[PDB]
Amino acid sequence: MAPVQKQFREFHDRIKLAQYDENQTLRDERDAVLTAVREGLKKVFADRGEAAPTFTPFNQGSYAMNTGVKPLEGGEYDIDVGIILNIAKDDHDPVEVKKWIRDALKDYGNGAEIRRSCVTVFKPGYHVDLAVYADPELSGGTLCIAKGKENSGDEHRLWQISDPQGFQDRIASKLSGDDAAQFRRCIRYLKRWRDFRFSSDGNAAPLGIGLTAAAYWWFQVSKRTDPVSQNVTYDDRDALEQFVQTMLDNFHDTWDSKDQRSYPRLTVELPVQPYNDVFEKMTGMQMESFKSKLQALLNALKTAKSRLELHDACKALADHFGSEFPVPEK
Numbered sequence: 001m002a003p004v005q006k007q008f009r010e011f012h013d014r015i016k017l018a019q020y021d022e023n024q025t026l027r028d029e030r031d032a033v034l035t036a037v038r039e040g041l042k043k044v045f046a047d048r049g050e051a052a053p054t055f056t057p058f059n060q061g062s063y064a065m066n067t068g069v070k071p072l073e074g075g076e077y078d079i080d081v082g083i084i085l086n087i088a089k090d091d092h093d094p095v096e097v098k099k100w101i102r103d104a105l106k107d108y109g110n111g112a113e114i115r116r117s118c119v120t121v122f123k124p125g126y127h128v129d130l131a132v133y134a135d136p137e138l139s140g141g142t143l144c145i146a147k148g149k150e151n152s153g154d155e156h157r158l159w160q161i162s163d164p165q166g167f168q169d170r171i172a173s174k175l176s177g178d179d180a181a182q183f184r185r186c187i188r189y190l191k192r193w194r195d196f197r198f199s200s201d202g203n204a205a206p207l208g209i210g211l212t213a214a215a216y217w218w219f220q221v222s223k224r225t226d227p228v229s230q231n232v233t234y235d236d237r238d239a240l241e242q243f244v245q246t247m248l249d250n251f252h253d254t255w256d257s258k259d260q261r262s263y264p265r266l267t268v269e270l271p272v273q274p275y276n277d278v279f280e281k282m283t284g285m286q287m288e289s290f291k292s293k294l295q296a297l298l299n300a301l302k303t304a305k306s307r308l309e310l311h312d313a314c315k316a317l318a319d320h321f322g323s324e325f326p327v328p329e330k
């Protein structure tokens with residue numbers, strides 16, 4: 001392996017988090033929550049003199065897709081799980097259904113919170129986000145997620161067509177073998193970049209989902225095959241330079257009539273239902289700051305290439321990737 005490739009592979013080793021299938025801890029913490037949901041629904045529904053609805057859980061998010069990273073000191077693990085309740089969506093309000101889940105987890109961990117798109121339960125060092133779905137068998141074949149907050153109007157409480165497994169398939173299937181490894185490594189690099197240079201639980205923070213979907217559209221492998229030996233070498237720095245430049249190229253200056261100015265906006269559609277712009281909640285100013293840091297990271301990746309000293313090349317990247325990017329002495 002070439003010098004800088006070695007440093008990127010070490011970085012990847014430091015930031016990577018084992019996926020559900022390879023991580024006893026995540027499964028046990030996930031299962032602790034799923035049990036406290038089953039236990040809690042018995043109490044809730046018996047209280048109401050009915051039988052508890054049942055549910056099928058399924059792994060979701062980066063922990064299901066092998067694109068998870070370790071948080072920086074003071075951050076939390078983000079344990080994503082779907083639950084398919086044995087109900088017909090047309091018999092029930094979506095927020096009422098998320099209320100069941102909230103009520104069931106009342107006393108567990110550090111309390112539960114109905115978010116727009118999940119119920120989140122808190123533990124020291126991690127949160128589980130429960131995406132709550134109706135039975136497609138009882139709901140007309142489509143899998144629909146419970147959207148809405150308690151404090152949200154009729155228009156904003158809906159059952160929306162969802163395809164998390166379709167998304168997981170799309171991320172798993174785009175490439176194979178060492179090509180798909182480089183894709184996953186590069187998604188992780190940008191998640192640590194997000195964590196280092198952006199604010200946690202700030203919309204300003206370009207979501208993992210968005211960088212994942214950007215990679216789906218625009219990631220390109222960077223490798224070389226030796227003409228004579230057929231030996232293959234990967235260039236994660238070059239893969240990241242092409243990918244970041246492509247993202248930057250896809251921003252469009254978008255007039256805002258309210259502010260009487262333009263903001264650069266990057267649109268990234270989910271490639272499965274509901275095909276929404278995953279970055280649609282980011283403001284114009286948050287989009288402006290996103291583009292500027294994306295550009296400074298591009299400028300770093302190019303500078304890294306032309307440095308004579310491994311030390312200076314690695315320092316330029318660590319300015320963007322944080323203190324776990326290895327910097328050898330000069």
Ligand SMILES: Nc1ccn([C@@H]2O[C@H](COP(=O)(O)OP(=O)(O)OP(=O)(O)O)[C@@H](O)[C@H]2O)c(=O)n1
Pocket residue numbers: 060061062063067068069078080129163164167168191207208209212270278
């Ligand atoms: N706007 C969104 C947000 C989330 N999801 C779905 O919910 C999952 C969990 O979302 P999130 O935890 O935000 O993303 P991850 O892909 O897990 O990324 P990260 O590692 O940064 O948490 C996504 O993978 C996706 O299947 C979605 O469809 N649309």
Ligand SMILES: Nc1ccn([C@@H]2O[C@H](COP(=O)(O)OP(=O)(O)OP(=O)(O)O)[C@@H](O)[C@H]2O)c(=O)n1
Pocket residue numbers: 060061078080114115116117118129130131145149162281
């Ligand atoms: N289709 C989706 C959308 C979101 N999520 C979960 O919810 C989170 C993203 O929520 P988001 O829609 O970005 O929240 P807001 O609309 O900002 O909601 P609120 O104002 O309640 O915070 C992710 O971590 C993921 O676990 C999901 O599982 N599936």
Ligand SMILES: [Mg+2]
Pocket residue numbers: 061062063078079080208
């Ligand atoms: Mg996640």
Ligand SMILES: [Mg+2]
Pocket residue numbers: 061078079080129
């Ligand atoms: Mg989450």
